[PDB]
Amino acid sequence: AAPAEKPDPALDATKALPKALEEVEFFQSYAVRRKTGFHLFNRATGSPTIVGPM
Amino acid sequence: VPVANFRPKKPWDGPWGIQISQKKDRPFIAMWILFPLLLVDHLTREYYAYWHSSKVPVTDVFGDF
Amino acid sequence: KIDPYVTSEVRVQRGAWWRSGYFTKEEVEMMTPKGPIARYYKFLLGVRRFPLKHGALSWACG
Amino acid sequence: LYLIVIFYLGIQIYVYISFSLSFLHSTILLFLVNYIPHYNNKSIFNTFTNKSIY
Amino acid sequence: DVPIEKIPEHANVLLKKIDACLEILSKDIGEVTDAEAHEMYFETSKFQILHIYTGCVASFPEGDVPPGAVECLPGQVIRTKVNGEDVMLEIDEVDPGYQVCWFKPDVPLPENAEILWSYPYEPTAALPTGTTWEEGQANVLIPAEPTPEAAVWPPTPVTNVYAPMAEKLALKSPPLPFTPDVLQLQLEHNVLKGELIDRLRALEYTIVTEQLQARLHERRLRGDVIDEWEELDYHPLVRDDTYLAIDFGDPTFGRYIWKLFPHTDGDEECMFKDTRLDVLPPQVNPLNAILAQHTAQTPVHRSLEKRLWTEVRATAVSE
Amino acid sequence: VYTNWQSSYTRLFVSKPWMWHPLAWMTLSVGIWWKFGKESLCNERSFYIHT
Amino acid sequence: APLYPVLSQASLYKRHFFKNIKLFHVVFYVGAPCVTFGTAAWSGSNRN
Amino acid sequence: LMNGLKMRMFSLARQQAPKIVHKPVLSPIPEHLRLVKNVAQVQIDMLKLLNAQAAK
Amino acid sequence: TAVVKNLAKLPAATSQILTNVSKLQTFHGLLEERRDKYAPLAYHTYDNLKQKTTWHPIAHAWVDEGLPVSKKEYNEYCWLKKDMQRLLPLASPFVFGIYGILPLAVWLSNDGYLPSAFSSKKDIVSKKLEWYSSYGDDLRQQVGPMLQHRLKRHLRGTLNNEHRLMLDEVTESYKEIFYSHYTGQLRDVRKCAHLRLYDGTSTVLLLTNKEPVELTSELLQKWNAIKAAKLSPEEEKKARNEALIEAYKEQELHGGPHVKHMQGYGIPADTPLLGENAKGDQYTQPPESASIPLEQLEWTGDTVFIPAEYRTEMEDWGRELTKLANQFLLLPWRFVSNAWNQRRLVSWFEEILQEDALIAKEGGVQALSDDELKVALLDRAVIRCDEELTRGDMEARYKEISWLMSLRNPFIVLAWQTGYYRSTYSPEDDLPEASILPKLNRTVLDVDVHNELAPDHPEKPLPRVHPALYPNSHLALAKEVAVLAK
Numbered sequence A: 001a002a003p004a005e006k007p008d009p010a011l012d013a014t015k016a017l018p019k020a021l022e023e024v025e026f027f028q029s030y031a032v033r034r035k036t037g038f039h040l041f042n043r044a045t046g047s048p049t050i051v052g053p054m
Numbered sequence B: 001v002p003v004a005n006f007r008p009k010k011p012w013d014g015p016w017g018i019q020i021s022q023k024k025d026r027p028f029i030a031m032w033i034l035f036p037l038l039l040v041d042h043l044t045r046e047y048y049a050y051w052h053s054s055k056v057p058v059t060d061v062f063g064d065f
Numbered sequence C: 001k002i003d004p005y006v007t008s009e010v011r012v013q014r015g016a017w018w019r020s021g022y023f024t025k026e027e028v029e030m031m032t033p034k035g036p037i038a039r040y041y042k043f044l045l046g047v048r049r050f051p052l053k054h055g056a057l058s059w060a061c062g
Numbered sequence D: 001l002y003l004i005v006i007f008y009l010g011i012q013i014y015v016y017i018s019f020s021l022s023f024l025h026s027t028i029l030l031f032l033v034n035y036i037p038h039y040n041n042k043s044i045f046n047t048f049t050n051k052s053i054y
Numbered sequence E: 001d002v003p004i005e006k007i008p009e010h011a012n013v014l015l016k017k018i019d020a021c022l023e024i025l026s027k028d029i030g031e032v033t034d035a036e037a038h039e040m041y042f043e044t045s046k047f048q049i050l051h052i053y054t055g056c057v058a059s060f061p062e063g064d065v066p067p068g069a070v071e072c073l074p075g076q077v078i079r080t081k082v083n084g085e086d087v088m089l090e091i092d093e094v095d096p097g098y099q100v101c102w103f104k105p106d107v108p109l110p111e112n113a114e115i116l117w118s119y120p121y122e123p124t125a126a127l128p129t130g131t132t133w134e135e136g137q138a139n140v141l142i143p144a145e146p147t148p149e150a151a152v153w154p155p156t157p158v159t160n161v162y163a164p165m166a167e168k169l170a171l172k173s174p175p176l177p178f179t180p181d182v183l184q185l186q187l188e189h190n191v192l193k194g195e196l197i198d199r200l201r202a203l204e205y206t207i208v209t210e211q212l213q214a215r216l217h218e219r220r221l222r223g224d225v226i227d228e229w230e231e232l233d234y235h236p237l238v239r240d241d242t243y244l245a246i247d248f249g250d251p252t253f254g255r256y257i258w259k260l261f262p263h264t265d266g267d268e269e270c271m272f273k274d275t276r277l278d279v280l281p282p283q284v285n286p287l288n289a290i291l292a293q294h295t296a297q298t299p300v301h302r303s304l305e306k307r308l309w310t311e312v313r314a315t316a317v318s319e
Numbered sequence F: 001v002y003t004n005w006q007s008s009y010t011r012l013f014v015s016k017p018w019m020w021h022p023l024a025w026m027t028l029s030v031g032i033w034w035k036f037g038k039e040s041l042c043n044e045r046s047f048y049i050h051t
Numbered sequence G: 001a002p003l004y005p006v007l008s009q010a011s012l013y014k015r016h017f018f019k020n021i022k023l024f025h026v027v028f029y030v031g032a033p034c035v036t037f038g039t040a041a042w043s044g045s046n047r048n
Numbered sequence H: 001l002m003n004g005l006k007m008r009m010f011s012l013a014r015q016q017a018p019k020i021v022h023k024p025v026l027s028p029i030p031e032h033l034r035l036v037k038n039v040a041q042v043q044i045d046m047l048k049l050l051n052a053q054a055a056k
Numbered sequence I: 001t002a003v004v005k006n007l008a009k010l011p012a013a014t015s016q017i018l019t020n021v022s023k024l025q026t027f028h029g030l031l032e033e034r035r036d037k038y039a040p041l042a043y044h045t046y047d048n049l050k051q052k053t054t055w056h057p058i059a060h061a062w063v064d065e066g067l068p069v070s071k072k073e074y075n076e077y078c079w080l081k082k083d084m085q086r087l088l089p090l091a092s093p094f095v096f097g098i099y100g101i102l103p104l105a106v107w108l109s110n111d112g113y114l115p116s117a118f119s120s121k122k123d124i125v126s127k128k129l130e131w132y133s134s135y136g137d138d139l140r141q142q143v144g145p146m147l148q149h150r151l152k153r154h155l156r157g158t159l160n161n162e163h164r165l166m167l168d169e170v171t172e173s174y175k176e177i178f179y180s181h182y183t184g185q186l187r188d189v190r191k192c193a194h195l196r197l198y199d200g201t202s203t204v205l206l207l208t209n210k211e212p213v214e215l216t217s218e219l220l221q222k223w224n225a226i227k228a229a230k231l232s233p234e235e236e237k238k239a240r241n242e243a244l245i246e247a248y249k250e251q252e253l254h255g256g257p258h259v260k261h262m263q264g265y266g267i268p269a270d271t272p273l274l275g276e277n278a279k280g281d282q283y284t285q286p287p288e289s290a291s292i293p294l295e296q297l298e299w300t301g302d303t304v305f306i307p308a309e310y311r312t313e314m315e316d317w318g319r320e321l322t323k324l325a326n327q328f329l330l331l332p333w334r335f336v337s338n339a340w341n342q343r344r345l346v347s348w349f350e351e352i353l354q355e356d357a358l359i360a361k362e363g364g365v366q367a368l369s370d371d372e373l374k375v376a377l378l379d380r381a382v383i384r385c386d387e388e389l390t391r392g393d394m395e396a397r398y399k400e401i402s403w404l405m406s407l408r409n410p411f412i413v414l415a416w417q418t419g420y421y422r423s424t425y426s427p428e429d430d431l432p433e434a435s436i437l438p439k440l441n442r443t444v445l446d447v448d449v450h451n452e453l454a455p456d457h458p459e460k461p462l463p464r465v466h467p468a469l470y471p472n473s474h475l476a477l478a479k480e481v482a483v484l485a486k
């Protein structure tokens, strides 16, 4: 009854999405590739595929 | 005269710290022996019943039969 | 077990018993237990016995 | 399919745990709300006793 | 049975002890540099490791790569030998409008290329020589590592009024300007003596835990590995409280530190600091608060009477 | 320094309801099987329901 | 003068091999043979 | 650092013994003892002066 | 082994057991005869949940100031009560059968499990010291630290909730009381009394024919003065009732007793009139005593102690802390509710208080021997037998815990006691080195009990001022001076 507790920043949600995006960025950093030996069959339109470049 | 709040160890003081460490890493050691045993228990297994089976493996626990 | 000051601790404030005249004499009387155990104990007040401190021995002796 | 499966099942396990605990609160732990305010003491170095009177 | 002149001898002994402790504990183990400990940092790079011992590495503008050149993008690891030193070079932040490639001798270099470093022709050699980065070829930066000021504990001041009086005695050899009350001085002396001895016993008690932590650090400095619990036994007072916290079964922590030491409240990295100097015990004498309450309660004629009680005591000692 | 953690499992069990929880769980599950699943499934008179 | 049964350096070197495991070191290393020779792929296909 | 490039160089050599760095340890015990010394010297000078007065 | 060694004297022990039982019966007859006419009725009270009794020393621990008994005879009484407790395994064959003799063998194996009759010594002090040094100090030295941890974790709470439960003013005192085995410095008992700040204000309502009145220092002083004047009862009761009505008016001006506005307690207002019973504006029905004029205010002889222990009360301690408190004090603890262990602890408390009274009658602590004082401190659980202290340190220790037990709070008592049972063991043989300073010595003068001490602010602790440095200390310490110089 009326304890008057200050806000605890550890109970906030301001780090989960940044951390997940950091993990995804670490994943995608390993997709960097050199131009030599590069080939990817695009669609018939000429647009890239989804699974191809990943 | 000796320093206060110090004494020799006794049996009820429990084991030393190195012994507690030796206690802790026993599961970690048995892990290496048990995971292969798990895989062997699954891989070296045979089903117990088939459409043709007239019998099924029975295990009398207390030898009453 | 007899006195309604103690048999009322669950429901009644203790302050209702400290205020003199809050409960009347007949009112205190109806709140007392009337069973045979209460009457046995009421008789046993004036009976000589061998008291012990409230604990495991007083309980074991029953 | 790996990502889909793990994302879905992690969401479901989080739902199970979080909702189980929220319902534990709303169903069983609100009985045990006993807020005691802090009352300052004054008679620290002296206590009235049975011998003070009797 | 302990005269007051024998105290500074004990203080010197304990100073020797704690100095022998701190000269060891002042040392600390730096970061490990064994490549076998960090080989997986390079194994897990986004590109395979280039074992480069022939040809040249050249910077040239971005665009088409010459066929035969091995691109060296940011994140590329390169095992080489530089001035006789086996090394790993990790590419980081290649400049824009430019790219780097390893050109073996079979591969012709393009125009507008700048050879950053090159290798010699040694085909018969079994152990290659590698490179020789001359002064101006490569700017290698050693970390400065500026050793900050050594953390000094504040010495509290002590006003020795009687040293000038001893000097005046040596000059004359009354000496004093006032009439000391020998009873009140022997009172303060006898009380203060026990407070000093009782303080030294507490310091000797604490030095035992420093010369225990230092004996272990001697082993840690020799390269010996100490178990987490073997190391705790050399902190016995903390070993006990830590074992009881385990018996209770509450592995949480952090708010206890924030309540006992409120200067750490809100500080998540409180454990990785040393803020004992920011929070020191005050040098306030509580006796002043006591004597002030004593005078406020008494009247003035009693204050003047005390001058009579003291004067009559002087004449009583005189007669 | 004495601890039931390293010197008495019984006093450790007694002093921790979160050590009683698995035991009560086990007892309750076995009682459930005894009351409900024993005679309806495992008895010889009730074993053909597995067919 | 340690009063406890001091453990040799080599014994600690060997125990570190056992207690320096991480979670993924178990999960994936045991899941690969398991997923391949398990109820999904090989053992399951055979036995079913 | 090179023209158009930046790199990180790591050595490859076994570390046979640990590397030592002198990080001085802050402690209040030496200053405790020095304070004890100073207070005791104050009292010693006091006693010497009082003895000189009482005897001279 | 010890089994056959005790079987050798088991025939010689039954006669002494029965003689001791007779002594116990005679002493209990005397004590109860005095108690049944000089002591008040401490009514039984149930805990907040109202299922088990709760016990406090202020109401239940009575001290017979005027007990015509020697201190050694009371020691015999208490020790023989403990021996009766230790005689309980003799019932095992009479409930299990002839195969219930192996428990009796286990009983006869260890001498610490046994009563006095199996001891070769004669004097109660030497016997008690033998038992302690053989079994009891060792048994106590393995419960002290864990009990201390339980008391700490009772204050600060579980699961990282110290910011919600602990106080920021008892912080430095908490540290000095519970973490002085880190510093090695002595402790001031007043810093343990500061732990009572976790609790509320302890009050005492005297019940009258009209209303309850809160007891104060002024009213108590007046009542003591009237008691000392030795007046006729026609004058005594008149003066008592005058002081009582004065205090009643004073508290009515204060805003009523403290208990009216305390969570968990309260005085009901006038009862309400329901519905048609309401006579217009008079919605209330005052009690019968409202008819009595206030000048007839008389004390009923009934009292209500309200400790207001919101965090210290023995009910909220738990199943484990109570057992460990009884273990540390070498009392029975197994297979009983916390109410029964509460009573056992309160009875131990009463015994210690009566022993303190008899010691003060016998000429204080200095009249005691060295072994007798050692045994007293062992009973108080402030000394362990592996210390070998001085006489002055022992006297100061006795004075400290005696004042602390005068306050009638077991929690702070246990917090004080457990600090003297925090001993470590080194892993090395050379360390700890042989000390250079002499043994710790103190005196009764070094203990500050006659002065109040405010709680030091958090992270701003102040040094300790000796009592001798206070003004007019030679006048206040004159009793201790006369006792020590003689």
Ligand SMILES: COCCOCCOCCOc1ccc(C(C)(C)CC(C)(C)C)cc1
Pocket: A023, A024, A027, A028, A031, A053, A054
């Ligand atoms: C534990 O959490 C880590 C899970 O993260 C998984 C992320 O999975 C998505 C990665 O798949 C991609 C997607 C896009 C791409 C590249 C195709 C970024 C786009 C590119 C190279 C053309 C710029 C590479 C990989």
